[PDB]
Amino acid sequence: NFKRISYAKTKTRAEVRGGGRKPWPQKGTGRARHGSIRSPLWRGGGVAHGPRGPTSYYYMLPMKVRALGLKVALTVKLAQDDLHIMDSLELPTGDPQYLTELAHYRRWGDSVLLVDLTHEEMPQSIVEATSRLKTFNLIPAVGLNVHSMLKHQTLVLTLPTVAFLEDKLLWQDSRYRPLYPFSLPYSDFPR
Amino acid sequence: ISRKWEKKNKIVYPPQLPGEPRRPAEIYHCRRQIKYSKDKMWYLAKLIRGMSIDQALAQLEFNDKKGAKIIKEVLLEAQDMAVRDHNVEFRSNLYIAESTSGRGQCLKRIRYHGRGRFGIMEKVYCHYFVKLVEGPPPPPEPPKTAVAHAKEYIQQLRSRTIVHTL
């Protein structure tokens, strides 16, 4: 919901074409009194309470809350035997059929999420295999998120990624309240 | 619109067994978009309901209403249709089983009144439906007699029970 923008919009009685003149005199006609032909009571009139897009649903949870959500999702994967640790993601062959059979042999479920430390240093063997697969997704360590972990049955993390995750997640537990955004220089940050 | 009456002449029954009774021939015919009122056409359709094919033509021929000629023309082409297409031996051996009128598609026109006011008149159209069944017309139901009334009343008195008890 934080990055959702709703583009639905309707025209109110002030934005529908025409309707300036009173359709008929107030009294004497024997009909219901009306002041415009674009009233919401009318066919083809404006919308009383409709969408007024574009509408933004942007909101941010506290940084520690969103950092804690990754810890909970990682713990759930380990507790339910849905987490597997690899020394490296290198494959003997780039054929995607090898990866699918490997997951089936090891009982990794229908969907497997593969996480590597950095996008640039991803092995070419795994990249070719995952590009041709739909239920096997390869993302960098910076791209880990609760939604992707929950959508994919199995989570695969490399040894450098585990160290990367521990450094980033545990940094929130022992950090000062910020004087200014952490993008600005700090004495001991980054690293 | 619906045209289900024209489709009732396309039903092919399975052949009868040698011991089965003869099935009367049923003929469905209708005329669509008749420039006449269904209310006025109903009386003509009601008049010939239950009559034989020949008696219905006689009554319609000497009727001053406009729809009488239209209905008579429908019966004449339905009577020929029975013998020519529906395998009816005698053209006089038919009776009016069903005959009724239905509303058709109508056109709306403006009728001018005084003081700049107006009313909307409709150019009324109607449909006429007729069903012919082979065989002599069924006899009319005899009027209920005093014996039937007395027998029914005694049956009512012999069917009453002690209510609201065991």
Binding site: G28 | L107, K108, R115, G116, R117, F118, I120
Partner: peptide, 20 residues
């Protein structure tokens, strides 16, 4: 009191001109 006259309102002509 003043005269209270309400002019008649003619409906659009197309509503009574449709044909088969």
């Amino acid at each position: 009191t003043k005269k209270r006259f309400t002019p008649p309102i003619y409906q659009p002509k197309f509503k009574t001109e449709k044909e088969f």
